[PDB]
Amino acid sequence: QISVRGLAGVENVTELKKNFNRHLHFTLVKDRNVATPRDYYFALAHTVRDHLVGRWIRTQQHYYEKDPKRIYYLSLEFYMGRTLQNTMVNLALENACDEATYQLGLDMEELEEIEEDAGLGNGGLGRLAACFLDSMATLGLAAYGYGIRYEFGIFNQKICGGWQMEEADDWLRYGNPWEKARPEFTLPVHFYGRVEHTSQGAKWVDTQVVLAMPYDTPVPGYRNNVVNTMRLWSAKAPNDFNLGYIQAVLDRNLAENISRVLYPNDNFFEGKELRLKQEYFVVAATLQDIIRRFKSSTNFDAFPDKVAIQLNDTHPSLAIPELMRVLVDLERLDWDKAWEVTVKTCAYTNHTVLPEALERWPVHLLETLLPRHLQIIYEINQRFLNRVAAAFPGDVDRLRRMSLVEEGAVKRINMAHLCIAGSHAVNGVARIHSEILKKTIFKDFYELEPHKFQNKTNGITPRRWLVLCNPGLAEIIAERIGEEYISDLDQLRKLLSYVDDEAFIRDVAKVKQENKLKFAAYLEREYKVHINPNSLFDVQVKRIHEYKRQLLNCLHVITLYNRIKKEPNKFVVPRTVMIGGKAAPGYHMAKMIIKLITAIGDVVNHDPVVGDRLRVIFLENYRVSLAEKVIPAADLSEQISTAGTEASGTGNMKFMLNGALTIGTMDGANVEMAEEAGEENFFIFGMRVEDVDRLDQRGYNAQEYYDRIPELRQIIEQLSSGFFSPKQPDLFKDIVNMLMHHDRFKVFADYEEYVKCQERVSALYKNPREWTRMVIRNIATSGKFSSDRTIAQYAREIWGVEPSRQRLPA
Amino acid sequence: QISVRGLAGVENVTELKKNFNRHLHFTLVKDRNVATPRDYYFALAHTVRDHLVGRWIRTQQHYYEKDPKRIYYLSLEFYMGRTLQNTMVNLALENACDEATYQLGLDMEELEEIEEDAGLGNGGLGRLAACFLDSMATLGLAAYGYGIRYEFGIFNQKICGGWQMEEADDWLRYGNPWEKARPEFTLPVHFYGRVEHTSQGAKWVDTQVVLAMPYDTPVPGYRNNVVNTMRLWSAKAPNDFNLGYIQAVLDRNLAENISRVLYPNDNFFEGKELRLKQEYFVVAATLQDIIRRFKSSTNFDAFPDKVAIQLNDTHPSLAIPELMRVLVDLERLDWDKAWEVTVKTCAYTNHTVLPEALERWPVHLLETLLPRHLQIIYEINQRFLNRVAAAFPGDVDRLRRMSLVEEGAVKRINMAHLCIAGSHAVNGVARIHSEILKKTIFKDFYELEPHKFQNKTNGITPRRWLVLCNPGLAEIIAERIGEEYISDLDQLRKLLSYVDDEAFIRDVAKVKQENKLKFAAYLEREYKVHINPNSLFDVQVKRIHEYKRQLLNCLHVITLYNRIKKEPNKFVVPRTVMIGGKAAPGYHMAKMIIKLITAIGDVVNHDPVVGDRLRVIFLENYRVSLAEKVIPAADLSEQISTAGTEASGTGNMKFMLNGALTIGTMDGANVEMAEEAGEENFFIFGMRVEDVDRLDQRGYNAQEYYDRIPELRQIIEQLSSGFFSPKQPDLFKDIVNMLMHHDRFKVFADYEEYVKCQERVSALYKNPREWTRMVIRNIATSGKFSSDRTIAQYAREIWGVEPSRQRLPA
Numbered sequence A, B: 001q002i003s004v005r006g007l008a009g010v011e012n013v014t015e016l017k018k019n020f021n022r023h024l025h026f027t028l029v030k031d032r033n034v035a036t037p038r039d040y041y042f043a044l045a046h047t048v049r050d051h052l053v054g055r056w057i058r059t060q061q062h063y064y065e066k067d068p069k070r071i072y073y074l075s076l077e078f079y080m081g082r083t084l085q086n087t088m089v090n091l092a093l094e095n096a097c098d099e100a101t102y103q104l105g106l107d108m109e110e111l112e113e114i115e116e117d118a119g120l121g122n123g124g125l126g127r128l129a130a131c132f133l134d135s136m137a138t139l140g141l142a143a144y145g146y147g148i149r150y151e152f153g154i155f156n157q158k159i160c161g162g163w164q165m166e167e168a169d170d171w172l173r174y175g176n177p178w179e180k181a182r183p184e185f186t187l188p189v190h191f192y193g194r195v196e197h198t199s200q201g202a203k204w205v206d207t208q209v210v211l212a213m214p215y216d217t218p219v220p221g222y223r224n225n226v227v228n229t230m231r232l233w234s235a236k237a238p239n240d241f242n243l244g245y246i247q248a249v250l251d252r253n254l255a256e257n258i259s260r261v262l263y264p265n266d267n268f269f270e271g272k273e274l275r276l277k278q279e280y281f282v283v284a285a286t287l288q289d290i291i292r293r294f295k296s297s298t299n300f301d302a303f304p305d306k307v308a309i310q311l312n313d314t315h316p317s318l319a320i321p322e323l324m325r326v327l328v329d330l331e332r333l334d335w336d337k338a339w340e341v342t343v344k345t346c347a348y349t350n351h352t353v354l355p356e357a358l359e360r361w362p363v364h365l366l367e368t369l370l371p372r373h374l375q376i377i378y379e380i381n382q383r384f385l386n387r388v389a390a391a392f393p394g395d396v397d398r399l400r401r402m403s404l405v406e407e408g409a410v411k412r413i414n415m416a417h418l419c420i421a422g423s424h425a426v427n428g429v430a431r432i433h434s435e436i437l438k439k440t441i442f443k444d445f446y447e448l449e450p451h452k453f454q455n456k457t458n459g460i461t462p463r464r465w466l467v468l469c470n471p472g473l474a475e476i477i478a479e480r481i482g483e484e485y486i487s488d489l490d491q492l493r494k495l496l497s498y499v500d501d502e503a504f505i506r507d508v509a510k511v512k513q514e515n516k517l518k519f520a521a522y523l524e525r526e527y528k529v530h531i532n533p534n535s536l537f538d539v540q541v542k543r544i545h546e547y548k549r550q551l552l553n554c555l556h557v558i559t560l561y562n563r564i565k566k567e568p569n570k571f572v573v574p575r576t577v578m579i580g581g582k583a584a585p586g587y588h589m590a591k592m593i594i595k596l597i598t599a600i601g602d603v604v605n606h607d608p609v610v611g612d613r614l615r616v617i618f619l620e621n622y623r624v625s626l627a628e629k630v631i632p633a634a635d636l637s638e639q640i641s642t643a644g645t646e647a648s649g650t651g652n653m654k655f656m657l658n659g660a661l662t663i664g665t666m667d668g669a670n671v672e673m674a675e676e677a678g679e680e681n682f683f684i685f686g687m688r689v690e691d692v693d694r695l696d697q698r699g700y701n702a703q704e705y706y707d708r709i710p711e712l713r714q715i716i717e718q719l720s721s722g723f724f725s726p727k728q729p730d731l732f733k734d735i736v737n738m739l740m741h742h743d744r745f746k747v748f749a750d751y752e753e754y755v756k757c758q759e760r761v762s763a764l765y766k767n768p769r770e771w772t773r774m775v776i777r778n779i780a781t782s783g784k785f786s787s788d789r790t791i792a793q794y795a796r797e798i799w800g801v802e803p804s805r806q807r808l809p810a
């Protein structure tokens, strides 16, 4: 049908059809008479998977022969989503499979909807890892993603009576065609035990053993025949485990629980033992794999020349003392040499400045679980603090501030401090965030080792986030400037010369309308909700957190409702306000915010006076597959975090690429987005970081705003009195109390400017032509936000490797 | 190489080679440069599996079109062993695959050794189910085996310091190529809850739900293109299970533990809740499947015309009240009609008379777990006892004896009584056993309903137990009488005309010598033990139990040793005595017997005066794959249970078919074996059942034998004094105490006749020609013991279906 989806050749279509029929018979053990849509999905998945294998084997043997420097990306989260369409896109198989399935009497888009998301992440951090894997393969880097194969990913969210309910995401129920179990490469991981000092160094003895079994998933690059590997470890009990008999076998579950479930906290630290076990499990298994592969190329001087380890936040921070453990205790290297190798091998990416998200492990936990690692951490701290003392003599408070060990009621290890000490590079994820790191939380470290500190602004893959989810936009762009931009997104700048092109303006607006129609149809089918497709689609989708200020959005929604009710016969630009996102199961306030949103919807959506002018919808079970549907349909992207709180954001970039305009604070990557597009083409409002600082120095008093803004006062009085909960008048008392007395994120302080800015959005939307011209200027300047740019920078500035767009032989 | 292994055609070999290479590439994702023997095994298994699929699909659609009466064989155990060779044998692919792998530079026999046993059974009962499945497919019956897919089968046995150690049999670690998961056919199973009485019958409410997910394994018939199904259920938690969050997900293990592990008890009842859950789990899921398939053919009058349910012992006995539950509570049938259908549908096979093996469930367990089933059981009992009272008026003691409810300290339900009441046929498993049932434990029931009671003497499949494990013998037989005997074992009678044939005598003896050489080589390679291949191979392999009297064998071994030590320079026929078998983990005496055997070996095997004249070896980890190796190599089969204790035995039949002579008591199928071969061709000794009864009436006094037999006295004095345990003098005190004071199985009573009989064995072995002629007379009369004969009898006399040897189209 469309050009960017590749060729549908007679030979290819014929071959795909026969392999589809082969798999249905031999693999699924079904015939066309009893086969269901799910059977058809699996037959298609196996058919496409077959095309990966040759490339996968030859890529990995190529790395063995050429022996390039290997990049190991360690993460506790990989939010991969669906794999079928992505694989077809990267292999240029989409049109061919579309034709083949059509000739078999099947609709491929229907089949694609059957696949479960691989939901092995919480949101932004996990999705970044996934975009990064795609870019690393596209840029021909010898890269390996390493993590945990959770049996249960992020929970499925159900909404019952306006409240979030959680259910287990049993994503492996029907099997995972994309993974290859590798039980032959199983590795032992040690826990507990004790340290024994001998004539020749320390020994870690009397340990409990858990086995780490790897599952490998292919990661295809964009049309370059490169297929890299994501290796995820699964926990297994040894066969003599606990070996009355029956209970011993049943107790194997205790060891195997390590890989059972993803912790569902977004930007929050929970110091549970099981989480620590997960973190060591991934690190210990991965490092053995790294060392084995290095030895199969004695001389560890060359280790940093052949190995780069990237720590995705502090979650895999134990890699630092684990590498030291292996080099000192097992390989018999002297401390100083081992440390030099470790520092040159490891690099650390920080993803947030929120204090509650920072990992600070109680010493007593590490003492019991990982006694040798604690000893190593103490020794690292002593040697590091000796360096600080030499550089800043007499500065005793600096010594306590910089220590890896924090004193108090319970002694803790600061994992961020550990990472900085043991890494040659430390980066933030957007320019403003990286600057905040050097100015505030890591100021002392920057002063000691300025060369260590870098910025690497986040990005998103244009394969998943344009070509896959928005083929219509990809096609109209390709019609004018060709296909090269898909792996070189800076080429979108060429679209600036089409901003006054009448045909292009029409096409851009047509594509958006088509996307909105499709999404309005999706909503009616799966959720029985009706929306006006001519209204402005106002979208805020992201995890529910106070810092992200879904509450500020709520206040605007109520303002709009109250203004309509005051002047019902006055014209207003119609809006569909969509808010979606999951709350962490133990985060009470986040769960109350979800309830508020649905409660507002219950009032607004059923008021006859409002009509079709305002609709408020909560998007249930927000996840990667849903993002692919809603983002192409959006007109307005809500990126309204308090300045200085969102390290980068990546959702923001997805909306920019897909033809939505942005309303946002000068926070995270929003700053760079506005810089790229021009401030005139962005709806910027509210306090800057400096303004938040001034308010903090003075003391934030919410009452002041309540007293001086009558429209704001009305809303608070409505919430308190039970206007949005008639049967339970005091339901939202916690929310009002927080807003009025202990709001860390200053919702009221940005209210007036936010409402004002929203009026300017509505004004522009009244002029379709000028709205679309501004959209074109956003799409055209979104190139910087490709994860190909991000990864090229990591490669050149941290890892010391050169990217390559050269094809491997097919 | 050999005829019975089929043709190796040019087209077939070429095709097998290319499909092997295809699977290695696309399925295993390996190339020849990094592939291991295990990879090669899996490539072969997938290649052979491909040949099953067409036949599997067309067999099942054939049953859908023809709608024959379906046979459902319910068992908690299916001891399948390895599948690769069996599949090749039944599909006539053995020589072709041998050639194809040879041309690829691989040894197929080496590859076959990689496959794990499917060890989902304890011994005889589980292996009977497996032989039965093979015969049902070979006889073209529409038969389905239903059970549980245990994650862990029978434990692997290790011997440490002469003691049994258990380890988990992680049989699924590398995956199971033979099963097909069918998550789409998952069914709910209910536990706990309460009974609610309404205007329209009882309702079972407030239940806990566990999901039953089926895995299907193909069961190929012998060269008839029939492929039946064994469906095994796996336990799964529902997704809202226990739905703080983390613990709820972790607690899913509680539901899923149902299918975790096989209870390792052979002939012993352990009244644990988890075992009851397993039994209901299989029954509830299976019955829903049966009813669904019946409805997809309202009128339950035809149910028994279309469905037969065979209960393999009392383990699936809950099928009776569960069928009643479904028919009465859910389908709204009247009690009397439902009962008529149930009785006509169900049949029960009893497998033992040992009191400790009989299932007697505490009422309080059933009350809590299955409250509705208990109510139904009570109602069945009341109506049954009303029938007894009408037939035998005033006989109050008969009423208490026959009741399904047993009174006492704890009230219990007798599951055997439940099965007899609710089945139209009740059978024992050998003529003597079936007679014992009518004369003793079920006398009252036989008197009430004589027509119900039948015999079905056990059998073994000649495919696995001759063609597969002993191709050399199969071939020399085929050379004379053709190939028809493999599916018509009665044809072996034709070999009686070759008993004086000098060429045949030589060939039979040659095949045995070759088998002995191969096994002697297997022992040295995998276990580093050296044996004389010219010695008589004296073998007792079976589960370790007091009734099987491994101890009597031990006494003879010591007698032989003591006689050698008394007269060292006197000639004796050299023996290798091999004893193998697993002990239940909680069975202390059985574990002590294993220790005794190894302790005797430690003394005998290292005495320089003995030389190579006597060797005592404990065969570690006895299992189906090991049986296939040792049975073809045996000269003497030890079947020495106390008369009236071994219901049938099946190991006995395997040895008979493979050219060993039998030393045995008149117990179980031994009686019929001797009847078939002629008593002159069997080494029969010891008490008959009537002799055991006489001794019981008089009182068994072991001291009498000790006092009157000096050779026996010596052995007891050696055991007591510490001759076989110098470092721990009193180690075997429990054994001596049991033998002397509380021996239920009268070891001493058969000692003299046993030793005498063994002398006659040694005498015959001195004359190779006459030994072999007697062997030929055993092989020639083993035909009755084919499970094809057994299944034909079940089909005609219980199930009301006719077997068929007709081919389905290929």
Ligand SMILES: O=[N+]([O-])c1ccc(C2C[C@]3(ON2)O[C@H](CO)[C@@H](O)[C@H](O)[C@H]3O)cc1
Pocket: A122, A123, A124, A125, A126, A128, A265, A266, A267, A268, A269, A313, A351, A352, A357, A429, A458, A646, A647, A648, A649, A650, A668
């Ligand atoms: O399980 N955690 O402890 C955890 C999860 C997710 C995060 C984050 C941090 C964050 O999103 N999720 O990383 C993204 C990728 O760099 C940024 O775009 C977000 O601004 C940041 O909040 C931090 C810690």
Ligand SMILES: O=[N+]([O-])c1ccc(C2C[C@]3(ON2)O[C@H](CO)[C@@H](O)[C@H](O)[C@H]3O)cc1
Pocket: B122, B123, B124, B125, B126, B128, B265, B266, B267, B268, B269, B313, B351, B352, B357, B429, B458, B646, B647, B648, B649, B650, B668
């Ligand atoms: O788990 N159980 O409760 C259980 C297991 C095995 C058995 C048996 C009974 C037995 O062997 N195993 O059945 C065979 C097949 O009919 C007979 O050949 C044996 O004589 C009998 O002991 C009974 C009960």
